[PDB]
């Protein structure tokens, strides 16, 4: 997260860290046994870390649980990142750290949201934080979004952030939450650089997938 602020411990209880030896992506806990992340975060042998604040210091709220399976969306396109959504089942249920509710309707442009993660904090150069970082940012008009990334935005994506640059998600934030008024509306997905002018963040549109999520959980 660049241009953000220190969330503070347990202020984002649904935030998850995906760890394969190192933190590589984020995720959102949607119930005691299931995490929502990005399809491009898929790998085998994911360990899910809940209740994290400082990912480099055990502080007391951590629950590290193996992923028993990771279901990538059937129509995920690894090249264009369309349908960039993945479900991870925990090997054992987490102790409820709390889940975030799914959306019942899509949010509109201009809506203020909370984006968070342990991603790089620099637009230029590199700095990876120990503690969880947060950013408040508005959803942008589908018009702005498409103009920023011509030929690349699908109906399953939205832009959020600041066209003037300086505040954005970044490498290490993928899979993580975009929450707007208590609902998970987005998944950190892609962008050109981080916090560059006219290059806002692009996010998976979670409201398009509520049905797939339910059905997938029920059959797995």
């Amino acid at each position: 997260i660049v241009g953000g602020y220190t969330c503070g411990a347990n202020t984002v209880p649904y935030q998850v860290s995906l760890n394969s030896g190192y933190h590589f992506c984020g995720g959102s806990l949607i119930n005691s046994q299931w995490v929502v992340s990005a399809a491009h975060c898929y790998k085998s042998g994911i360990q899910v870390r809940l209740g994290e604040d400082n990912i480099n210091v055990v502080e007391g709220n951590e629950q590290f649980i193996s992923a028993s399976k990771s279901i990538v969306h059937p129509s995920y396109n690894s090249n264009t990142l369309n349908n960039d959504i993945m479900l991870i089942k925990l090997k054992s249920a987490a102790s409820l750290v709390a889940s975030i509710s799914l959306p019942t309707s899509c949010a509109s442009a201009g809506t203020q949201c909370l984006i968070s993660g342990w991603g790089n904090t620099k637009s230029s150069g590199t700095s990876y934080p120990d503690v969880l970082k947060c950013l408040k940012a508005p959803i942008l008009s589908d018009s702005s979004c498409k103009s920023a990334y011509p030929g690349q935005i699908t109906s399953n994506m939205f832009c959020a952030g600041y066209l003037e640059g300086g505040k954005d998600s970044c490498q290490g934030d993928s899979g993580g939450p975009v929450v707007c008024s208590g609902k998970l509306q987005g998944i950190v997905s892609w962008g050109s650089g981080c916090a560059q002018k006219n290059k806002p963040g692009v996010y998976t549109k979670v409201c398009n997938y509520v049905s797939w999520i339910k059905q997938t959980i029920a059959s797995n």
Binding site: G21, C25, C170, Q171, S174
Partner: protein, 67 residues
Amino acid sequence: QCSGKQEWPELVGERGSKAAKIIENENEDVRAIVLPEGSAVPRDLRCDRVWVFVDERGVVVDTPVVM
């Protein structure tokens, strides 16, 4: 903390395809991915990936790093 060589300042100004080979030789745990400068990219964090951004002449435009 990733493993092996992490950054290639010497490769700025070099041909992309040539830099990619050098990178992969000097750190056997990464794959080099040549992309046009300004290409959008996923926002995951990896210890096995090195983007190599090139201008329209295929010249390395910034320091490749593991990320």
